[PDB]
Coordinates of C-alpha atoms and ligand atoms in Angstrom, one line a residue:
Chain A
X18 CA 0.0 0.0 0.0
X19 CA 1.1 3.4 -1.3
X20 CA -0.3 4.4 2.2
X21 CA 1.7 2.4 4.4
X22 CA 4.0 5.2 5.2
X23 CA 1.4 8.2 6.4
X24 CA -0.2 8.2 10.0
X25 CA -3.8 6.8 9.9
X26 CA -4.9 10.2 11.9
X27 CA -3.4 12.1 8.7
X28 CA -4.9 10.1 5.7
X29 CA -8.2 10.8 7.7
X30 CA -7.5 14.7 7.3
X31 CA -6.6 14.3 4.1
X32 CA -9.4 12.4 3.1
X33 CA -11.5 15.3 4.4
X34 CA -9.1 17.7 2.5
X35 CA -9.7 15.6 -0.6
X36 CA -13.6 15.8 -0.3
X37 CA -14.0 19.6 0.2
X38 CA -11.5 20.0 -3.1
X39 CA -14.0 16.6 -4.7
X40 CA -10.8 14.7 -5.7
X41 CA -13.1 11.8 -5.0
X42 CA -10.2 9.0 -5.9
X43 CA -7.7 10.8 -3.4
X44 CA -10.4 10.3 -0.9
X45 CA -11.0 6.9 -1.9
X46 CA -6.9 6.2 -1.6
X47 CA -6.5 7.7 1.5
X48 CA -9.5 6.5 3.2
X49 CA -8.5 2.8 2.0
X50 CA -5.1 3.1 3.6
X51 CA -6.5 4.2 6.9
X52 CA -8.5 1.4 6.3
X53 CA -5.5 -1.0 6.0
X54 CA -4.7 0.5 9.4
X55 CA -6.1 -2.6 10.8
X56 CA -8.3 -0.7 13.3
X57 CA -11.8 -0.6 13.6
X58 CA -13.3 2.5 12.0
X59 CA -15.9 5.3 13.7
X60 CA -18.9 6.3 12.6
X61 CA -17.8 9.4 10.8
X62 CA -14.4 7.5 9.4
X63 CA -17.0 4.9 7.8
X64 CA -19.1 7.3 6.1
X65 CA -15.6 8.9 4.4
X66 CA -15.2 5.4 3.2
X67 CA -18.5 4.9 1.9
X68 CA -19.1 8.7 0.6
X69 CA -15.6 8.5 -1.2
X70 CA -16.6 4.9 -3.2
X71 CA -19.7 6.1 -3.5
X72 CA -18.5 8.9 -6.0
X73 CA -15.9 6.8 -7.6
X74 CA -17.8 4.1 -8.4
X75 CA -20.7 6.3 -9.3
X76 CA -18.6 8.5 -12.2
X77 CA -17.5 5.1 -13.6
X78 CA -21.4 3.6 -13.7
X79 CA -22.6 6.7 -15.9
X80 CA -19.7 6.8 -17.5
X81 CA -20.0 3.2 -18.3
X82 CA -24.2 3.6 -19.1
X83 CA -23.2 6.4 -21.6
X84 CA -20.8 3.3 -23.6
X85 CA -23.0 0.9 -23.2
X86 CA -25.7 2.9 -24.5
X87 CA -23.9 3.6 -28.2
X88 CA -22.7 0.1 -27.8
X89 CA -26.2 -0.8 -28.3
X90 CA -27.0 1.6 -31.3
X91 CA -24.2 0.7 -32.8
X92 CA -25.6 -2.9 -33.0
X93 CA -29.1 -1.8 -34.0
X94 CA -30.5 -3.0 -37.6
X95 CA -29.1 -0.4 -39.4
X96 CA -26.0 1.1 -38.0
X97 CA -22.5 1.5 -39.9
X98 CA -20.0 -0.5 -38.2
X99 CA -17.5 1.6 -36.8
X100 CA -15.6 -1.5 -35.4
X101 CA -14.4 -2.6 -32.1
X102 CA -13.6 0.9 -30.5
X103 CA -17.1 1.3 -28.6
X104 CA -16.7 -2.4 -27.1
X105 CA -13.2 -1.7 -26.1
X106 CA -13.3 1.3 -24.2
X107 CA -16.9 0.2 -22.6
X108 CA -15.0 -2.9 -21.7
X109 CA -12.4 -0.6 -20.3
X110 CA -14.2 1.1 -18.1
X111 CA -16.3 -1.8 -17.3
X112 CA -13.1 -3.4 -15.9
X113 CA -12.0 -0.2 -13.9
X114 CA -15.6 -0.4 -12.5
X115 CA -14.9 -3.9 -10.8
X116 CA -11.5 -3.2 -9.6
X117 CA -12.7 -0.5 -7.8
X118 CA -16.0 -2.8 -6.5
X119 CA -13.3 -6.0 -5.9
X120 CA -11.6 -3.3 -3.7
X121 CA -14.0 -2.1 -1.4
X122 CA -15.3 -5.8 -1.4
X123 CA -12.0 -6.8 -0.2
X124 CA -11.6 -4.3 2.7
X125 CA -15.3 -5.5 3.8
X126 CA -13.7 -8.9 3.9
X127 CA -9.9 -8.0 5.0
X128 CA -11.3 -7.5 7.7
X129 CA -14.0 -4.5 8.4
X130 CA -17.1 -6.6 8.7
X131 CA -15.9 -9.6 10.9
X132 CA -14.9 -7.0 13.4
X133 CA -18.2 -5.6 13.5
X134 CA -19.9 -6.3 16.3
X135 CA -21.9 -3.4 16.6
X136 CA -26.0 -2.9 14.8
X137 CA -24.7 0.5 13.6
X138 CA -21.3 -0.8 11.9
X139 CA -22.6 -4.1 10.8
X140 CA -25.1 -3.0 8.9
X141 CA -23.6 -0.7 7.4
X142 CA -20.4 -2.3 5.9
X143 CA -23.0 -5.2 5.4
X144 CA -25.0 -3.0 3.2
X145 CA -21.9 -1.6 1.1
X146 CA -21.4 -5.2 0.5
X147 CA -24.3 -5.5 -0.8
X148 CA -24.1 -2.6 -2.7
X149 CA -21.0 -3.0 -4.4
X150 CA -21.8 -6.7 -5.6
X151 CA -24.7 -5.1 -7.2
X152 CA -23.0 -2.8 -8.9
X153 CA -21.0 -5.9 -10.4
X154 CA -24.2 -7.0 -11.0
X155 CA -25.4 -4.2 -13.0
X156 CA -22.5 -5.1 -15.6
X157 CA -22.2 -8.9 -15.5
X158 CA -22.9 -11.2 -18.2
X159 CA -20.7 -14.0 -17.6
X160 CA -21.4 -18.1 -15.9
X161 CA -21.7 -15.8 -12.7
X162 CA -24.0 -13.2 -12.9
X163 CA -26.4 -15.7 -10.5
X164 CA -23.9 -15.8 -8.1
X165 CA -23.0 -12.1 -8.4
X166 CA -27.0 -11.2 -7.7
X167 CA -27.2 -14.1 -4.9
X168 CA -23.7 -12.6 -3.1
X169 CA -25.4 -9.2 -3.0
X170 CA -29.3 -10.6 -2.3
X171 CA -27.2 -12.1 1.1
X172 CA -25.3 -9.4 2.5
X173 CA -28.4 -7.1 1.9
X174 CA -30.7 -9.8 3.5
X175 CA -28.4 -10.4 6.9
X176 CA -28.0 -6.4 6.8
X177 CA -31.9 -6.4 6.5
X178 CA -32.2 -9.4 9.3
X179 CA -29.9 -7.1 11.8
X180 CA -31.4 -3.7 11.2
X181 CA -35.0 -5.3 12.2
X182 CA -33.6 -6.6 15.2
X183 CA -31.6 -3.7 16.6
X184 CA -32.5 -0.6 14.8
X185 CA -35.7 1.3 15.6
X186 CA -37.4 2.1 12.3
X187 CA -36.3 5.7 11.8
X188 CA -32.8 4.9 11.8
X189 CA -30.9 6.1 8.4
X190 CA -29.1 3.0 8.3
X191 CA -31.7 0.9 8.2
X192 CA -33.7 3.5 5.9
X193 CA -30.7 3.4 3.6
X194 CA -30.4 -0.2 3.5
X195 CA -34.2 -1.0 2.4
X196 CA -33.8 1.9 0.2
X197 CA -31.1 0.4 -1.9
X198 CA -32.2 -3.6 -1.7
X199 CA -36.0 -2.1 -2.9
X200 CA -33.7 -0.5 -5.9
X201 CA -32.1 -4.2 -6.0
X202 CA -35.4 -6.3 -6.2
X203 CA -36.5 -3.4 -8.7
X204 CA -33.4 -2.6 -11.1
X205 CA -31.4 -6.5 -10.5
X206 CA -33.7 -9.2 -9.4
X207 CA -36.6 -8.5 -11.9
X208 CA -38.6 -7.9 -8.6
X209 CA -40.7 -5.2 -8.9
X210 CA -43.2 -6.4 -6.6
X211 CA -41.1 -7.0 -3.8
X212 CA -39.2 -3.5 -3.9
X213 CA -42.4 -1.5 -3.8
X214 CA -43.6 -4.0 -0.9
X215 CA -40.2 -3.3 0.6
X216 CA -40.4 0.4 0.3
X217 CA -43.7 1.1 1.3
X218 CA -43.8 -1.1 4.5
X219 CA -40.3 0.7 5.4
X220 CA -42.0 3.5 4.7
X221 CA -45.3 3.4 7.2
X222 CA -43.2 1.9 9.9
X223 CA -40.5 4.7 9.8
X224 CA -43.7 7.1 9.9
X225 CA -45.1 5.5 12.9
X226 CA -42.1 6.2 14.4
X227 CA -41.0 10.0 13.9
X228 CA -42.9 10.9 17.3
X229 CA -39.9 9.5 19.6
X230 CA -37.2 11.8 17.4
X231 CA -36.0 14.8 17.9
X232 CA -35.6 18.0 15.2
X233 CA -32.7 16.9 14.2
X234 CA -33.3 13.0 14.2
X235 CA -36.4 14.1 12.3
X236 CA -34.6 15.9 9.7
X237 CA -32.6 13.0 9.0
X238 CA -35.7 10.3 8.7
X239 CA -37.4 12.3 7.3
X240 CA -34.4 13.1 3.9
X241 CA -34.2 9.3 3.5
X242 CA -38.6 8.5 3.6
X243 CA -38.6 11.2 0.8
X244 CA -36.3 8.8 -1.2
X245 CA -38.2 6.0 -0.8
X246 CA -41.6 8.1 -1.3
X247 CA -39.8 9.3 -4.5
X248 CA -38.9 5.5 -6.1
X249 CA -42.6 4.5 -5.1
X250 CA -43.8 7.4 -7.5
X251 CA -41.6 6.1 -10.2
X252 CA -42.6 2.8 -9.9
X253 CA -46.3 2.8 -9.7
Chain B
X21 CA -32.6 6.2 -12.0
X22 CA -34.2 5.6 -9.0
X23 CA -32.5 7.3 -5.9
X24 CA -30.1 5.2 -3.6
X25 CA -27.8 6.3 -0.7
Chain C
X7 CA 3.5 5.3 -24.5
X8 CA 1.5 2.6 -23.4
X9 CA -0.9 4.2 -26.6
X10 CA 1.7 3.0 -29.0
X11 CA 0.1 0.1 -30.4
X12 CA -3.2 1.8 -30.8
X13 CA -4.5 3.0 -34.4
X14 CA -4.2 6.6 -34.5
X15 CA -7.9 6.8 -35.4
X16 CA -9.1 4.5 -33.1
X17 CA -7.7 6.5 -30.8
X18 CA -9.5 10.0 -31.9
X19 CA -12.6 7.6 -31.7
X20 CA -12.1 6.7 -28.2
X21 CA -11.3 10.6 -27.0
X22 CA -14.4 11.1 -28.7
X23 CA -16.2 8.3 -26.8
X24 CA -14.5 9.7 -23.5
X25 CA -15.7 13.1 -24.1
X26 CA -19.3 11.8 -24.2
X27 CA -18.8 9.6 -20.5
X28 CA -17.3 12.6 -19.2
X29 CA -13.9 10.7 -18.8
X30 CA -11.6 14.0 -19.5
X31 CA -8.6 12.1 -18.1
X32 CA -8.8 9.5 -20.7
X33 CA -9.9 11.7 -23.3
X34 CA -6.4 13.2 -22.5
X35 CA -4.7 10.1 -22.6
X36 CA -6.3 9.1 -25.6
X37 CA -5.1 12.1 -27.3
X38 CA -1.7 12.5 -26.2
X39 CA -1.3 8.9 -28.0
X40 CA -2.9 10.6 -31.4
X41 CA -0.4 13.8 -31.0
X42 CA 2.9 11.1 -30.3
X43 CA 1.9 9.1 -33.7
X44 CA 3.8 12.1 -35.1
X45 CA 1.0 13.2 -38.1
X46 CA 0.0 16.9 -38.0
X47 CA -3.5 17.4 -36.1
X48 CA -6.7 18.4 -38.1
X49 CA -8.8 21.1 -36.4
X50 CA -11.3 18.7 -34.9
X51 CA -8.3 16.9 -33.8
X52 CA -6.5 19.8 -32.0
X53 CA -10.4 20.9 -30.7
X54 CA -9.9 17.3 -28.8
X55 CA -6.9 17.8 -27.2
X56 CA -6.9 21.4 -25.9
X57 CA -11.3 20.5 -24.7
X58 CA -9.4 17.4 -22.9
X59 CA -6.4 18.8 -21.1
X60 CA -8.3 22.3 -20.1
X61 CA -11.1 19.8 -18.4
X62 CA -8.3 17.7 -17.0
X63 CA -6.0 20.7 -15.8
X64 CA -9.5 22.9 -14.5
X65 CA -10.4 19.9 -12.0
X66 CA -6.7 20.5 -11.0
X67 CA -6.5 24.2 -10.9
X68 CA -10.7 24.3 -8.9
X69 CA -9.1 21.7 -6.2
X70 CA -5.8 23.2 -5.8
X71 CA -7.4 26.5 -5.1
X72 CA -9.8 25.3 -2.2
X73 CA -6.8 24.0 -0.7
X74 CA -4.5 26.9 -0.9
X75 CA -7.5 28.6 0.6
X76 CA -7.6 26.4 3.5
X77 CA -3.6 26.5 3.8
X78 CA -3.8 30.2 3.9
X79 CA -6.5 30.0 6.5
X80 CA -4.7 27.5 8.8
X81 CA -1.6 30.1 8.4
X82 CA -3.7 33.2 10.0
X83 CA -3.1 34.7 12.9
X84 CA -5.1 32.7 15.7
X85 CA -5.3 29.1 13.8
X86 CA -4.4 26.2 15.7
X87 CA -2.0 24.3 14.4
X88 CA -3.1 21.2 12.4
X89 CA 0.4 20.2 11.1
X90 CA 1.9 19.6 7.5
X91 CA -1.2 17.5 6.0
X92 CA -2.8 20.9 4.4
X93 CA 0.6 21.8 3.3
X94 CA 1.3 18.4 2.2
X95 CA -1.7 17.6 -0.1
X96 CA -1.8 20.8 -1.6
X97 CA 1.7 20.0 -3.1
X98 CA 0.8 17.1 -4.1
X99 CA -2.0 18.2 -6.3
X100 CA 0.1 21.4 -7.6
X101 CA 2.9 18.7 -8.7
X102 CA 0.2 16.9 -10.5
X103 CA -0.7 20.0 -12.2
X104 CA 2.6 20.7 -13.2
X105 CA 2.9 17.1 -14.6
X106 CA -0.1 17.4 -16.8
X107 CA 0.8 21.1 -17.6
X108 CA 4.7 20.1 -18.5
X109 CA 2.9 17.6 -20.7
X110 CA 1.1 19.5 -23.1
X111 CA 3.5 22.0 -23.2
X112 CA 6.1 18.8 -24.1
X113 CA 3.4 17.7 -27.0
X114 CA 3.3 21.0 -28.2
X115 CA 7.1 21.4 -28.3
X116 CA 7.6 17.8 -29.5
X117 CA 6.9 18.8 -32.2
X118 CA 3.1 20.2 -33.1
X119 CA 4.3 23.7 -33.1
X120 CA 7.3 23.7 -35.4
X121 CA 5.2 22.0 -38.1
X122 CA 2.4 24.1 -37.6
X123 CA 2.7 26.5 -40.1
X124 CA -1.2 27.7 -40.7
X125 CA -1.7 30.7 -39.0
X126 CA -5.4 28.7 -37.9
X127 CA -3.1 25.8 -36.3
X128 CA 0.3 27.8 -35.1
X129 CA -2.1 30.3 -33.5
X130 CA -4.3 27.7 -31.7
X131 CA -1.4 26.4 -30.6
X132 CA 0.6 28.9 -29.1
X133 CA -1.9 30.2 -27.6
X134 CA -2.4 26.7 -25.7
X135 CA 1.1 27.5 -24.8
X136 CA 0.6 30.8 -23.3
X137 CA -2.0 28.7 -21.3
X138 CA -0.5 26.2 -19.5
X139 CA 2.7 28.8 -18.6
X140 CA -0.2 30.4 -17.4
X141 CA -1.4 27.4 -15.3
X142 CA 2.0 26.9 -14.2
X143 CA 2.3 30.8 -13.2
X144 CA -0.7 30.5 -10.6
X145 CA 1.1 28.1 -8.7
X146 CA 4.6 29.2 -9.1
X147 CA 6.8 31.0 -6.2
X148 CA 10.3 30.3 -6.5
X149 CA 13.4 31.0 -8.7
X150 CA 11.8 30.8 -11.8
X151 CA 8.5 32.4 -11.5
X152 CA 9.5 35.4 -13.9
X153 CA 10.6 33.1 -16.0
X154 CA 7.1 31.0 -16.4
X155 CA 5.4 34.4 -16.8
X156 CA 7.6 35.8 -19.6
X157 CA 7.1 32.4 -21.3
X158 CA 4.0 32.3 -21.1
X159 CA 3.9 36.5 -22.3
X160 CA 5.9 35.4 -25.1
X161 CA 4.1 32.8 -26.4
X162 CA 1.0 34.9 -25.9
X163 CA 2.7 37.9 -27.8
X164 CA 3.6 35.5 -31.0
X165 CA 0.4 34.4 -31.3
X166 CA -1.1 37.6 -31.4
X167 CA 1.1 38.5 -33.5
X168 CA 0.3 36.1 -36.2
X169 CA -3.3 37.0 -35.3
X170 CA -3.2 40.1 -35.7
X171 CA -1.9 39.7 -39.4
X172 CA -3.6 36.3 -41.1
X173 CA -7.0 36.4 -39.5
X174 CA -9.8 38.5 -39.4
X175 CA -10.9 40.4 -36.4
X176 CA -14.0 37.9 -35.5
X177 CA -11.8 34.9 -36.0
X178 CA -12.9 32.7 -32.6
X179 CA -9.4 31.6 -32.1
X180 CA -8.1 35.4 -32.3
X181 CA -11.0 36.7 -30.4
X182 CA -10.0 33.4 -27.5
X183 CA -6.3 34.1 -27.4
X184 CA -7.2 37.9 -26.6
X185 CA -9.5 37.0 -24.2
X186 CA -6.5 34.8 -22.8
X187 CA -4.1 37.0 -22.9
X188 CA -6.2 39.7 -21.3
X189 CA -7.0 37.6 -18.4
X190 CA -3.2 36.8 -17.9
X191 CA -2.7 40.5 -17.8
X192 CA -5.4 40.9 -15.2
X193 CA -4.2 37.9 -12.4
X194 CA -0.9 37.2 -13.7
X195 CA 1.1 39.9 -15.1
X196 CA -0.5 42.6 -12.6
X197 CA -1.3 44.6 -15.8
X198 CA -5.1 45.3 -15.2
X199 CA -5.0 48.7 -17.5
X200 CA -3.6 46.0 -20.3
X201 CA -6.0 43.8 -19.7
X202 CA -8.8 46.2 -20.1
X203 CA -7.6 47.7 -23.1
X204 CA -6.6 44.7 -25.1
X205 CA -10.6 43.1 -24.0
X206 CA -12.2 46.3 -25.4
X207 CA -10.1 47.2 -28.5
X208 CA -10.6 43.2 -29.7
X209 CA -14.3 43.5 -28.8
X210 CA -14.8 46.9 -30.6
X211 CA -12.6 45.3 -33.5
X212 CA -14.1 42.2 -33.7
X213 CA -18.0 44.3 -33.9
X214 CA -16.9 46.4 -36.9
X215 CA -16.5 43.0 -38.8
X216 CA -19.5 41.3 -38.1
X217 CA -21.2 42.3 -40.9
X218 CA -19.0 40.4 -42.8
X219 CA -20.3 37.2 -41.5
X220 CA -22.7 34.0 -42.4
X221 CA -25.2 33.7 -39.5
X222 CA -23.3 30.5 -38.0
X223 CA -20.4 32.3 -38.2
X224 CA -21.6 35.2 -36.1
X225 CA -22.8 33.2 -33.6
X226 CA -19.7 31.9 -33.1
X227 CA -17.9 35.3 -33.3
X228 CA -20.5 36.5 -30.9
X229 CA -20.2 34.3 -28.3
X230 CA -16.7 34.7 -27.6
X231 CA -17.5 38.7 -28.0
X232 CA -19.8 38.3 -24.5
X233 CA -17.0 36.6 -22.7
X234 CA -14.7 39.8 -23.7
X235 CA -18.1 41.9 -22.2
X236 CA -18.7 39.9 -19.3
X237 CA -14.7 40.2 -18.0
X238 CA -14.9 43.9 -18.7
X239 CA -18.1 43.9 -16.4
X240 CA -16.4 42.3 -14.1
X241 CA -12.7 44.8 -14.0
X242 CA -15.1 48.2 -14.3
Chain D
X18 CA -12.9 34.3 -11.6
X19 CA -12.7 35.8 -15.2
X20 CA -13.6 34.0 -18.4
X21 CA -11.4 31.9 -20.6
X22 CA -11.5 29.7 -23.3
Ligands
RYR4 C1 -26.9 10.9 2.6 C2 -27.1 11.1 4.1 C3 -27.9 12.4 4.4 O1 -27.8 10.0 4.7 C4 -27.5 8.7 4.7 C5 -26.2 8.2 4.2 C6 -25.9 6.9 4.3 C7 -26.9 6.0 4.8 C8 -26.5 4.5 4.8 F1 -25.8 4.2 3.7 F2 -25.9 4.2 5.9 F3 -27.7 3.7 4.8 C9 -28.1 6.4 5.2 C10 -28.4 7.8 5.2 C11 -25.8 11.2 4.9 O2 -24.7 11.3 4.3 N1 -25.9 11.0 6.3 C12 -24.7 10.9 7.2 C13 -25.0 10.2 8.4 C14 -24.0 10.1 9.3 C15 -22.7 10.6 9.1 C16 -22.5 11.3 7.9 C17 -21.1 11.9 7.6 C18 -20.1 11.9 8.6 S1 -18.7 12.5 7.8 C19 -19.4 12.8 6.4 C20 -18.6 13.5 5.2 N2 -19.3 13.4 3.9 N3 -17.5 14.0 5.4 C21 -20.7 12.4 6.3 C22 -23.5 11.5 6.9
RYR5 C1 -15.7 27.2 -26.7 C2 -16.0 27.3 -28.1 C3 -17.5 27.6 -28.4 O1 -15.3 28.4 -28.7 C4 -13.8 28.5 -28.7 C5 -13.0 27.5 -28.3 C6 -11.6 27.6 -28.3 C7 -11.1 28.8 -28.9 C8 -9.6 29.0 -28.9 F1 -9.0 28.4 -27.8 F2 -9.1 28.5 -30.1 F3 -9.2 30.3 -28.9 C9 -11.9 29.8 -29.3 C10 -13.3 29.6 -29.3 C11 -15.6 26.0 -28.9 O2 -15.4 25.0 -28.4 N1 -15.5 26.2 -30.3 C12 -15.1 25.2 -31.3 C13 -14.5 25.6 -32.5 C14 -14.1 24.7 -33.4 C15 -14.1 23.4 -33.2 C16 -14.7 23.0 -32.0 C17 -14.8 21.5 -31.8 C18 -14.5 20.5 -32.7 S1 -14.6 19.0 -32.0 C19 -15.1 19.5 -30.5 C20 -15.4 18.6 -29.3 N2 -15.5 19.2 -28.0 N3 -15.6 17.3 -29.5 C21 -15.2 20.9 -30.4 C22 -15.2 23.8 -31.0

């Protein structure tokens, strides 16, 4: 690791440094070498891992929708051949897309999750597992795109199994969570049904419970039901 | 797209 | 040049595919592999380089200037201390600008300016030149400074030159190189009575020949035009 | 800051 060398306390300021100037794959680097630490991260050095992916991986999937888009009209009845170009650089892309996924993956498994004993940590490196395979998913075409779906069906599900246990339902982690796996029954599992069920159940139950929060617990329930209000609207 | 966090 | 077994057009093909995923860093690699196959460089062609290195270089230039803010900040009278890490990461980002910056001006040198002998290509050209001295000059502070301004004042000053005698007052590339080389005056060369005077005689110029124009034409020619405006709004 | 192109 090009990281070995700098003080875990100073990639996290960095990391922060890197986010205010959005040099999203500095933040990425630096937050992964804190990572390879070998400590367990806080709540707030957690969310710089997950925002920092988050924005790397999520330049590379439009980017990557954009290719794969002409890719397709360039193989519509019709169109001129204009030769490999479009498959290479898609395919490019498509493989800088699951380094970056195989990466995070592999600091979930070396070793964030199996030190997380803690509902609030758990769940949510559980859920960027989860995440992350589906975002393989989203591209895979091979003898394992099964597998792929099933990896990330699991880690959402125990995530899922967790949160019900130990979260009230207002909390963003667990909002978050059945936000994205009602995306991932929608957009990956050809699931439609169980992703509105899944969002509108999280949905009333969070509701039910916005009378024990404070203002500013409120505010934050409150951002994530909007998101799950807004896919229901798209999907029905 | 629908929205995810 | 790991672009060096590449076809030369699929290469212009894939800048073109990067420009349309918003992938400005290999758009610039992409190019950089057309410009070292050693053929001369079309106008679309030299459009794609200098719309691939200014994105590349801007996302540089935007991040190093949040963190010279924050350096500066940390540095005031009452901060407390928060060691090198501000310091640090802001040179690293300023020695990645001056990597991609000491790039182009290496393409340019080797060799896309001595063969350029159109005034359409040697202007566009130097004026790139002038550019990225000019990149270099917002982040210089040692020996040499002086030295990265006059080069960029005298590539600048060539260009105009040549402008000035082989292309008509509305010429886009004329009317961008002044616009250029009037902002250099402003924030570089601590010449704001130069800038302002070079803006309004090539806007004046440039309106006294628009009659000479095809409506396409104008709108080009008039677009640049508002930029000249909208700087002189902005210095009066 | 001021315009360029
Ligand atoms: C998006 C939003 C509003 O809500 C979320 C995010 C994630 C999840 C899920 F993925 F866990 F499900 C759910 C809701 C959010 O970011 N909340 C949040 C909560 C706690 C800490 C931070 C934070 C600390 S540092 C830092 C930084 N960007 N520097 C950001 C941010
Ligand atoms: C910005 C704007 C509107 O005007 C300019 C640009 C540069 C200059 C100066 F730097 F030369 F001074 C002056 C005016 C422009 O981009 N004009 C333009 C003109 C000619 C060709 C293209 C083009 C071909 S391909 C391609 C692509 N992005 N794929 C873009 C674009």
């Amino acid at each position: 690791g090009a990281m070995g060398s700098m003080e875990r306390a100073s990639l996290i300021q960095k990391a922060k440094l890197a986010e205010q100037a959005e040099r999203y794959e500095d933040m990425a680097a630096f937050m992964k070498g804190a990572v390879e630490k070998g400590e367990e991260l806080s709540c707030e050095e957690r969310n710089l891992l997950s925002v920092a992916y988050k924005n790397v991986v999520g330049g590379q999937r439009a980017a990557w929708r954009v290719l794969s888009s002409i890719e397709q009209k360039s193989n519509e009845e019709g169109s001129e051949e204009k030769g490999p170009e479009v498959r290479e650089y898609r395919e490019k892309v498509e493989t800088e897309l699951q380094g970056v996924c195989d990466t995070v993956l592999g600091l979930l498994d070396s070793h964030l999750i199996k030190e997380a004993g803690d509902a609030e940590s758990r769940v949510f490196y559980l859920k960027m597992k989860g995440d992350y395979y589906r975002y393989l998913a989203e591209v895979a075409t091979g003898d394992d795109k099964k597998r792929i779906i099933d990896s990330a069906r699991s880690a959402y599900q125990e995530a899922m199994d967790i949160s019900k246990k130990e979260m009230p339902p207002t909390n963003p982690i667990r909002l978050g969570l059945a936000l994205n796996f009602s995306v991932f029954h929608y957009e990956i599992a050809n699931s439609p049904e169980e992703a509105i069920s899944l969002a509108k159940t999280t949905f009333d139950e969070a509701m039910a419970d916005l009378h024990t929060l404070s203002e500013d617990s409120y505010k934050d329930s409150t951002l994530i039901m909007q998101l799950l209000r807004d896919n229901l609207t798209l999907w029905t | 797209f629908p929205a995810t966090v």
